[PDB]
């Protein structure tokens, strides 16, 4: 109602999008502006941290640089000896010139090559003024064969710039007093017509480059067409006399970046295809640890279906199309002006040498460029909801972090945006799943313990079953988050450093924070949850923790110490002594690959809990008779009397349990 | 939040997108290329629909 200003490209939109891409501009927030203040103080301590990091410490690191650099001042200190040697030979020899030629001295009597000729020695200014070969040797041009507009009319426009059009006369000399009135005004009028000719050849030939979309993408017609533009930017007057030739290379390519930028924008964002639910592959990394090891592995390394390049394809494609936004935009370092340098009279050297690579190629410069925004934000924002990565994509996103060291392009800042695809790619690094492990070990304890409130007994009458899920089949994703960290993550590499590993400490929080998440499994430490606890830990610690790459070993023997301590508590009314402790207490987990009768799902032979409590209370507690039984067997006395032939001294030892709680002759000597 | 609240007052849509149609004409007296402000009046449009 109070219609506000014309928002035409203010101090924002120079990545103020990417500035506001800290978390979200999703409603809205001034709270998020405070969050920006927090990230600003984070950068303030990281940059004061860089400051005193580099202020004496890496200013001595700069003195460690002054080994090489003061060494350059040491060969350059021989250049002080070469400079005082040449300056001493020419100092004393030029003093000998001061006494030699100036014997009279009197330069109008002893050295009068220039005192006879105070202006007549500077008498080589006869090329004035205009304008024969400015438009005759270049119609628009006459060029493209190292021809008279390349070889001659260019250099005639260098004569239009050799003519210093504002240094006209100095009337005691008076070389171009009135000749400078229209020398480069007709040479820059006719070359203003050649300038508008190359401007219409820039919008025209660059609209043909907008038609040039050769092969994914590739603007190869803009490369051979860029060979038809190196002479326009070489063109040494100089070439942009009033920032115009570069405006034919940049302001003409302003909209003609957005033909290539719109091209990649609609182009790269169309490769979308995914799966739905992969509990089968977690039954292949649960079937891996079943037949392993203890067997031949299983896994292969098996799937890990993410190792098939659903998103790792772009790691060589949208890092290469990002390397069209960067490295073929570093072939727009063959089209910036080009590479304006170098021809020098005025198209002489680039009349011969007009063939750049340009990409990438080294690093010693200072420059700036554009045309990489939406390919970067497309590659990262495309890769966003990726919750399986970057666990298996550790060396992928860290190779992306360590991609571009040695170029002079902004592909390092892309690799830093691809470090942001490892680091500003947020806590995935997924230790909020530990917050899901304690928070879902408390707010989901109303379902697993709802069958297991009494778990290892039957006082509140519940079966010892809770489950290890999260991280049960996520322990299968330790072999699937670790198996594809050696093939898929290794096939995502690049220049310095980039895998070269070297990297993937993620992947060491698959030791560190996986033993922290597995310490929440130690906070999750029921006997199908002790059985599922050590079966899940050892379902990762059969192959993934010895290759010995984990840190949950003491978590596995800690929850397995709770499997000994709670499987002989679930069988604390059964074994007693070893009569249920070998095939009926630990083998309710070993053969599984209310707690009195509730070990009867696998119930490995012999003397299971369905007979250690019944066929020991059926004329077996004293003996088949009474002290002692005539049976040491392996069929039913193993529940009855071979148990008594395996717990013989445990009769009097078990009767000693009443001898501390509430002498020993008539029971411990003559027990019959 | 004003939208589902009352009517939105209607002024909390009417006057709110009037005095916001001020700055939605910040997003309309020129736009190039404020995809920020374009996203702003974009969600204003979708909410109004």
Swiss-Prot record, chain A:
Does this entry carry the keyword 4Fe-4S? no
Q: Which UniProt keywords apply?
A: Coiled coil, Exocytosis, Phosphoprotein, Protein transport, Transport
- Gene Ontology annotations for the cellular component aspect, listed alphabetically: cellular bud neck; cellular bud tip; cytoplasm; exocyst; incipient cellular bud site; mating projection tip; plasma membrane; prospore membrane
The keyword Transmembrane helix is annotated on this UniProt entry:
no
Top-rank lineage group of the source organism: Eukaryota
The GO biological-process annotations, alphabetized, read as: endoplasmic reticulum inheritance; exocyst assembly; exocyst localization; exocytosis; Golgi to plasma membrane transport; protein transport; vesicle docking involved in exocytosis
A GO MF label: small GTPase binding
Free-text function comment from the UniProt entry: Component of the exocyst complex involved in the docking of exocytic vesicles with fusion sites on the plasma membrane.
Subunit info here reads:
The exocyst complex is composed of SEC3, SEC5, SEC6, SEC8, SEC10, SEC15, EXO70 and EXO84.
- Recorded family membership: Belongs to the SEC3 family.
Misc: Present with 377 molecules/cell in log phase SD medium.
Q: What is this protein called?
A: Exocyst complex component SEC3
Q: Which residues of the complete protein appear here?
A: 611 to 1332 of 1336
Swiss-Prot record, chain B:
Q: Which family does it belong to?
A: Belongs to the SEC5 family.
Annotated organism of origin: Saccharomyces cerevisiae (strain ATCC 204508 / S288c) (Baker's yeast)
One further remark on this entry is: Present with 3400 molecules/cell in log phase SD medium.
Q: What is this protein called?
A: Exocyst complex component SEC5
The organism's superkingdom is given as Eukaryota
- What is annotated about its quaternary structure and interactions? The exocyst complex is composed of SEC3, SEC5, SEC6, SEC8, SEC10, SEC15, EXO70 and EXO84.
Q: Which gene encodes it?
A: SEC5
Q: What does this protein do?
A: Component of the exocyst complex involved in the docking of exocytic vesicles with fusion sites on the plasma membrane.
């Amino acid at each position: 109602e109070s219609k506000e200003e014309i928002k035409t490209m203010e101090n924002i939109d120079d990545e103020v999008l990417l500035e506001i891409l800290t978390d979200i501009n999703w409603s809205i927030e001034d709270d998020a502006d405070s969050m920006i203040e927090r990230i600003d103080l984070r950068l303030a301590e990281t940059e004061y941290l860089f400051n005193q990091n580099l202020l004496s410490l890496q200013k001595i690191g700069p003195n460690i640089r002054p080994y090489e650099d003061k060494v350059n001042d040491e060969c350059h200190r021989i250049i002080p000896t070469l400079s005082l040697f040449l300056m001493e030979m020419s100092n004393f020899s030029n003093d000998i010139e001061n006494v030699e030629s100036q014997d009279n001295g009197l330069q109008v009597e002893s050295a009068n090559k220039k005192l006879l000729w105070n202006t007549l020695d500077e008498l080589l200014k006869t090329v004035s003024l205009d304008e024969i070969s400015l438009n005759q040797l270049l119609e628009c041009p006459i060029r493209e064969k190292n021809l008279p507009w390349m070889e001659n009319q260019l250099n005639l426009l260098l004569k239009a710039f050799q003519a210093i059009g504002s240094d006209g006369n100095e009337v005691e000399y008076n070389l171009r007093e009135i000749s400078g009135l229209k020398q480069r005004l007709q040479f820059y009028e006719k070359v203003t017509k050649i300038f508008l000719n190359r401007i219409v050849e820039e919008m025209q030939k660059k609209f043909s480059n907008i038609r040039g979309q050769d092969i994914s993408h590739d603007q190869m017609i803009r490369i051979l067409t860029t060979l038809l533009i190196f002479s326009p930017l070489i063109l040494f007057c100089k070439e942009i006399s009033q920032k115009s030739y570069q405006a034919i290379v940049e302001n003409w390519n302003v909209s003609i970046q957005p033909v290539y930028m719109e091209l990649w924008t609609k182009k790269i964002s169309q490769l979308q295809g995914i799966d739905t639910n992969d509990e089968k592959m977690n039954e292949l990394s649960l079937s891996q640890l079943l037949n392993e090891w203890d067997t031949f592995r299983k896994e292969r390394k098996t799937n890990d279906i993410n190792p098939v390049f659903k998103n790792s394809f772009s790691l060589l494609t949208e890092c290469l199309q990002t390397m069209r936004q960067e490295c073929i935009v570093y072939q727009n370092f063959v089209e910036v002006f080009f590479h304006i340098s170098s021809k020098h009279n005025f198209e002489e050297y680039i009349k011969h040498f007009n063939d750049p690579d340009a990409p990438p190629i080294l690093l010693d410069t200072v420059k700036v460029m554009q045309s990489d925004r939406e390919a970067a934000v497309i590659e990262t924002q495309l890769v966003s909801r990726i919750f399986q990565p970057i666990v298996t994509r550790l060396s992928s996103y860290f190779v992306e972090l360590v991609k571009a060291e040695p170029t002079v392009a902004p592909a390092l800042t892309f690799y830093l945006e691809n470090e942001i695809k490892s680091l500003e790619s947020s806590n995935h690094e997924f230790l909020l799943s530990a917050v899901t492990r304690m928070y879902t070990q408390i707010k989901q304890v109303w379902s697993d313990n709802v069958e297991e409130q009494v778990l290892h007994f039957e006082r509140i009458s519940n079966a010892t079953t809770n489950g290890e899920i999260l991280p049960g089949i996520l322990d299968l994703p330790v072999g699937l988050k670790n198996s594809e960290d050696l093939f898929q993550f290794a096939k995502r590499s690049m220049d310095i450093k980039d895998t070269d590993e070297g990297y993937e400490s993620i992947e060491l929080m698959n030791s560190s924070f996986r033993k922290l998440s597995i310490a929440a499994t130690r906070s999750i430490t029921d006997y199908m949850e002790t059985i599922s606890l050590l079966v899940n830990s050892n379902w990762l610690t059969e192959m993934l923790s010895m290759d010995g790459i984990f840190d949950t070993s003491l978590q596995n023997v800690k929850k397995v110490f709770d499997v000994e301590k709670e499987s002989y508590a679930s069988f604390l009314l059964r074994d007693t002594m070893p009569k249920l402790t070998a095939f009926v207490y630990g083998v309710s987990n070993i053969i599984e690959n209310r707690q009195n009768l509730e070990n009867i799902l696998l119930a490995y032979t012999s003397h299971e809990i369905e007979t250690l409590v019944k066929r020991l209370h059926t004329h077996m507690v004293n003996d088949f008779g009474y002290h002692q039984e005539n049976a040491i067997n392996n069929v039913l006395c193993d529940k009855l009397w071979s148990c008594i032939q395996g717990q013989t001294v445990s009769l009097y030892l078990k009767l000693y349990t009443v001898i501390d709680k509430h002498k020993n002759d008539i029971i411990s000597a003559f027990e019959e | 939040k004003r939208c589902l609240t009352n009517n939105d007052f209607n002024e909390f849509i009417i006057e709110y997108s009037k005095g916001l149609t001020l700055r939605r004409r910040f997003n309309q007296s020129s736009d190039a290329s404020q995809s920020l402000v374009i996203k702003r009046i974009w969600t204003q449009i979708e909410n109004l629909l």
